[PDB]
Amino acid sequence: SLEVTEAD
Amino acid sequence: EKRLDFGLLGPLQMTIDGTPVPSGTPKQRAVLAMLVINRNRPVGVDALITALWEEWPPSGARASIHSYVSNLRKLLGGAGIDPRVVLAAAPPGYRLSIPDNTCDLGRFVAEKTAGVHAAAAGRFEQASRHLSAALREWRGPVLDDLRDFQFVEPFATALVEDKVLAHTAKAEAEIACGRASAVIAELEALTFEHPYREPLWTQLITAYYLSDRQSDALGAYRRVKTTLADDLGIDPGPTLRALNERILRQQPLDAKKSAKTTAAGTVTVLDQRTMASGQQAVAYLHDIASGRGYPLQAAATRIGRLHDNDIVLDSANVSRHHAVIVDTGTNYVINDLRSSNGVHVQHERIRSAVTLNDGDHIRICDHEFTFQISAGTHG
Numbered sequence: 001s002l003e004v005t006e007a008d
Numbered sequence: 009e010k011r012l013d014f015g016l017l018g019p020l021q022m023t024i025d026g027t028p029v030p031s032g033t034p035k036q037r038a039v040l041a042m043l044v045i046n047r048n049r050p051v052g053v054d055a056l057i058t059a060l061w062e063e064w065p066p067s068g069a070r071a072s073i074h075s076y077v078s079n080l081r082k083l084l085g086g087a088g089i090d091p092r093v094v095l096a097a098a099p100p101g102y103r104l105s106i107p108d109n110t111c112d113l114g115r116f117v118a119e120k121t122a123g124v125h126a127a128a129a130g131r132f133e134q135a136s137r138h139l140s141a142a143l144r145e146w147r148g149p150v151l152d153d154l155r156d157f158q159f160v161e162p163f164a165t166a167l168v169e170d171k172v173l174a175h176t177a178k179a180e181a182e183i184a185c186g187r188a189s190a191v192i193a194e195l196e197a198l199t200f201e202h203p204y205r206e207p208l209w210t211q212l213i214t215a216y217y218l219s220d221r222q223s224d225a226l227g228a229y230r231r232v233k234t235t236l237a238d239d240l241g242i243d244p245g246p247t248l249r250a251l252n253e254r255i256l257r258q259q260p261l262d263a264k265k266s267a268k269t270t271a272a273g274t275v276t277v278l279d280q281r282t283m284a285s286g287q288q289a290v291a292y293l294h295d296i297a298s299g300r301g302y303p304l305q306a307a308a309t310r311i312g313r314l315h316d317n318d319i320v321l322d323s324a325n326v327s328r329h330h331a332v333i334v335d336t337g338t339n340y341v342i343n344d345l346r347s348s349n350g351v352h353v354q355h356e357r358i359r360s361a362v363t364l365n366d367g368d369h370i371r372i373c374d375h376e377f378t379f380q381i382s383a384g385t386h387g
Contacts, residue, residue, distance in 0.1 A: 001313060005348045006324035008373065 009088025014044045015112040017167070018147025020154060024087045031083065035060045036076040038157050043095070043104040045163065045307045047111060052101035055306070058316055059159045077102060113167075116145040117337040120174055124278065127181060127271035130264070135271070136181035142174050162343040162361070163308060166334035169341050169363050172205055177270065179211035184267040188218040203235055206245050213248075217255055218263060225255050240359070277339075280366050280382040289383035291340060293319065293333075296376045301384075304340070309333045311372065312345075325349055325373045333364070333379075340364040340381065349373050 015021030020037050022029045031037050038060050042051050057069050066072070081091035096103050108114035123138035149155070150164035175198055182191045195212040202208055209232045216225035229244070229252045236242050244252075254261065283289050293302040293309075302309075302319050311319040312330040321330070327347040334341050343361045344351040351358050352371040364370075366381040 001315075002328065003313075003324070005313070005327045008325055008349045 010086070011110075012084070012087040012089070012094075012106065013110050014047075014106065015147065016041070016044055017112045017116065017145055017150060019152040020044075021112075021147075022083065029083055029086065032076065032079055034154060034156070035072065036079060038154055038159075039073070039076045040080055041151055041154055042159070043102060044106075044111060047104050047106050047108070047114070049306065050098040050100040050103045051306070054316075055101065059157065062158055112145045112147070113337060116142050116170070116174075119145070120170070120177075120338060121278065123174075123177060123181070124271050124274045127177065127184075127267055128275050130268055132181045132184040132264070132267060135267075136178060136185065139174055139178040139181060143171075143178065146171065159308065162332040162334050162345070165343055165361050166336050166339070166341040169361070170336050170338050172202060172208065173338075176207045176211055177274075179208075179215070180263075180267040180270060183211065183215060183218065183263045188215040188263075191215050192219065199232075203232075204240065206232070206236075206248055210247055210251060213251055213255070214261060214263065214266075218261060222255060222258070226252070229255070277366075277381075283383050289381065291335070292380045292384065293370065293377040294380060296378060302377075304333060304335060307335050309335075321372060321375050323373055323375065326375070330372055340379070342370065 010025045011023075013021075013023045013026075015023070020031060020041050022031045022040065031040050039056055042056055042059050053070065053073055056073055057065050061069060077095065077097070081095055084091040084094050094105055096105060109118060119138045119142035123135045123142065126132075126138060127135035150167050151157075151160045154160050179191050179195060182188070192212070192215050195208065195215055198208050199205070199212055209228065213225045213228045213232075216222070216228060229248065232248065233244055236244055243249075281289055291304045293304070294300070295302070306318070309319060310317045310329065310332050311321065312328050313321060313323070313326045314328045317329065325348070327345065327349070329345050330347045331345060331351050332343045334343065341361050341363050342351060342353060342358065344358055349372075353362050353364070354369055355371075364379050364381075366379070368379040370377045370379050
């Protein structure tokens with residue numbers, strides 16, 4: 001997906 | 009009828025009877041580069057489109073690809089061969105069928121390999137000659153004229169692993185032949201250009217010590233120690249630390265044994281890449297959680313969340329384009345594409361790129377894999 005990456 | 013030759017180790021080159029032939033506009037040249045990188049393997053049209061236009065292909069991208077292939081075939085026809093045979097249309101994609109030794113990288117690979125077997129046999133003079141031949145194949149920055157294409161970046165970065173290894177093996181051979189003093193200057197130049205490459209420092213420190221320059225050897229260790237501490241926040245590795253301890257004690261070095269031992273290790277790597285048939289084994293990423301196997305099928309294997317990746321990982325925390333594994337023909341190297349969460353090899357965060365060893369643990373966020381170089385024995 002072109003969805004913003006979640007941060008760890 | 010006429011000699012056909014290609015070059016990747018510098019600006020892209022197509023030469024016919026030794027004369028360079030201009031290969032087109034940047035998009036057309038990128039097609040050629042992709043085909044040469046993947047020589048003797050099909051490259052899909054979808055892969056070509058991504059390489060040329062990454063995020064924004066024009067609506068007539070496929071017509072353009074057909075035109076680029078037609079154009080490139082006309083150029084290849086100048087060597088007096090059948091262009092439809094040499095650059096053949098697969099239903100998969102397109103395949104450039106050329107002998108390995110007609111590519112500068114192919115020659116680099118062959119000479120490096122010959123140098124490995126020679127050193128493993130204690131034939132250091134010959135090893136050094138093969139390594140000189142390998143390094144001569146480099147003209148400039150990898151695909152210099154296409155540096156504005158993203159695909160060039162991880163490929164060029166991977167090939168530096170190989171060049172550094174060749175420089176190091178050449179230094180080892182020269183030192184094993186008794187010419188430590190004659191390599192100091194080049195090593196000094198190389199450690200400036202590659203300041204974080206501990207194997208290069210190992211060879212420079214060794215060269216000083218065997219040239220009756222003990223204090224310079226110790227000074228060089230102190231220099232790399234400071235560099236690694238200040239710049240990266242790490243200590244020197246065990247190889248450097250053990251060398252330092254020998255020099256402090258004025259203990260002897262065995263440069264011939266060292267050069268043989270390094271080469272023997274590399275022969276093991278060469279072996280696991282090769283099947284009984286002589287064909288390259290297919291390297292795999294095996295997902296530990298699921299058991300799913302992902303074969304590495306092209307020179308570059310792109311990994312990320314976006315659908316256009318070769319290996320798609322759906323998790324929200326994985327970057328759209330997270331990593332690339334590059335097969336250089338000598339090593340597999342993993343590249344972190346400035347991802348949010350990073351790439352972890354052997355349970356530590358990689359700084360930019362690392363050469364992968366057989367059986368390495370690879371972690372991308374919550375996804376964990378075994379990288380296997382050696383051919384599978386069950387399925």
